[PDB]
Amino acid sequence: GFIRDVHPYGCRREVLNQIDYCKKAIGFRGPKKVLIVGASSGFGLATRISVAFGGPEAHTIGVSYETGATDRRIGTAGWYNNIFFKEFAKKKGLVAKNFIEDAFSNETKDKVIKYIKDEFGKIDLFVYSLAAPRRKDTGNVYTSRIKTILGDFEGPTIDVERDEITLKKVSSASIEEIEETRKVMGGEDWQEWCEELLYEDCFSDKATTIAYSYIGSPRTYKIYREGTIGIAKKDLEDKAKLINEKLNRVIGGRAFVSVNKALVTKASAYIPTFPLYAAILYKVMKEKNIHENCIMQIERMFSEKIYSNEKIQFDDKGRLRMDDLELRKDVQDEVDRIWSNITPENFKELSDYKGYKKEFMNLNGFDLDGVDYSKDLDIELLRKLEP
Ligand SMILES: NC(=O)c1ccc[n+]([C@@H]2O[C@H](COP(=O)([O-])OP(=O)(O)OC[C@H]3O[C@@H](n4cnc5c(N)ncnc54)[C@H](O)[C@@H]3O)[C@@H](O)[C@H]2O)c1
Numbered sequence: 001g002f003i004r005d006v007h008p009y010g011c012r013r014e015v016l017n018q019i020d021y022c023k024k025a026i027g028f029r030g031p032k033k034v035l036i037v038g039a040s041s042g043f044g045l046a047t048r049i050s051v052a053f054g055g056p057e058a059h060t061i062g063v064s065y066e067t068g069a070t071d072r073r074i075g076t077a078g079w080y081n082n083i084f085f086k087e088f089a090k091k092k093g094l095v096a097k098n099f100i101e102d103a104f105s106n107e108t109k110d111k112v113i114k115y116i117k118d119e120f121g122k123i124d125l126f127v128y129s130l131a132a133p134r135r136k137d138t139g140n141v142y143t144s145r146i147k148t149i150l151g152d153f154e155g156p157t158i159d160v161e162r163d164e165i166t167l168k169k170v171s172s173a174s175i176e177e178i179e180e181t182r183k184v185m186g187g188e189d190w191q192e193w194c195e196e197l198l199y200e201d202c203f204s205d206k207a208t209t210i211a212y213s214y215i216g217s218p219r220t221y222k223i224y225r226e227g228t229i230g231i232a233k234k235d236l237e238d239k240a241k242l243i244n245e246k247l248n249r250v251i252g253g254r255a256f257v258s259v260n261k262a263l264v265t266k267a268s269a270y271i272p273t274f275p276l277y278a279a280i281l282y283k284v285m286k287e288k289n290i291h292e293n294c295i296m297q298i299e300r301m302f303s304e305k306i307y308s309n310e311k312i313q314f315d316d317k318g319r320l321r322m323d324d325l326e327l328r329k330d331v332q333d334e335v336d337r338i339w340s341n342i343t344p345e346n347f348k349e350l351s352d353y354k355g356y357k358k359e360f361m362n363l364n365g366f367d368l369d370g371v372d373y374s375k376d377l378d379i380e381l382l383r384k385l386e387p
């Protein structure tokens with residue numbers, strides 16, 4: 001029998017690589033009691049590692065939805081990340097709790113809050129960053145769709161299995177899809193978490209909460225500012241204000257949206273035009289030593305913009321812009337320069353495809369220096385592993 005999409009110890013190592021980046025950094029202080037929804041991967045994971053080993057030596061509750069190994073299956077990356085982060089966190093004497101539940105349901109929130117007042121203590125930083133393809137409740141099921149609102153979006157995607165470009169297309173969304181996508185990817189559940197945490201008295205005074213977005217360049221506005229994702233994110237952005245206002249009154253805190261930069265996801269892999277833009281961008285930004293990955297993105301966000309000596313610099317919209325380096329004039333030009341020369345035949349050498357692909361396999365624990373791949377694994381060893 002063979003591994004599939006996830007390597008369990010490549011996952012250990014990847015978490016560890018991000019921990020080691022954090023341990024070595026200039027270090028910051030601020031949060032001590034931290035709640036993350038969507039803690040098992042991407043920014044949730046990086047945020048969790050950045051607050052635990054960034055030097056705040058903070059305690060964390062991760063909410064995430066993942067499954068593990070049975071005698072037949074191997075389980076998800078996020079599942080293993082949760083386990084290894086616990087392991088490495090307890091070894092440092094920090095609390096890492098794991099609720100592996102549906103975050104959208106009330107009986108989950110009640111589990112979480114119940115846990116906070118009883119054992120954990122007042123949360124000082126709340127990060128909401130779950131990306132689900134679907135939601136529940138009531139008893140209805142809403143599905144998230146990546147679509148336009150008018151016309152078509154076609155552009156190149158990257159087939160990492162076959163190292164080639166494929167032109168893929170995205171059509172227009174029905175009114176209800178526009179609406180299901182807003183229930184999933186908008187800031188409603190965020191808002192409801194926030195409120196229930198506030199009134200059940202779980203926010204430390206001046207406490208902070210973020211949610212994460214993406215804006216992109218004009219090339220992708222049809223999708224990210226105009227489409228079903230853009231409408232979901234403009235809703236999220238809107239709820240940011242309605243919470244900033246509240247927590248500022250009741251407990252003197254703040255809420256806001258952080259606009260992250262272009263990163264390689266699985267879910268970003270089959271949106272048109274973005275895989276290729278990001279691979280180009282990766283090159284551009286590497287030949288300017290300003291490329292950042294997920295953990296550098298978050299480290300920088302905390303130790304320079306949120307929890308630094310200086311005062312917090314917001315955009316003209318109440319949004320923290322961590323895509324500031326991505327959207328710099330010189331950088332965008334160079335992408336637009338390279339874009340017009342890219343072909344299905346030469347793309348591998350005009351964009352940082354290598355790095356783009358490396359970063360894909362790494363999410364899943366593949367292609368990592370520090371791991372023995374030809375080695376075999378034991379299924380009974382992975383199942384006994386618990387969060
Ligand atoms: N390039 C991009 O398209 C791009 C760039 C920057 C930011 N983003 C934004 O990044 C944010 C996070 O990106 P990511 O890479 O961190 O995502 P990710 O997909 O890696 O993270 C998903 C998290 O959601 C958790 N989750 C999923 N369903 C859940 C559920 N039902 N209940 C509880 N938890 C659940 C998952 O367990 C996981 O923790 C997203 O909000 C996305 O919009 C996207």
Ligand code: NA
Nearest residue numbers: 038043044129
């Ligand atoms: Na996340």
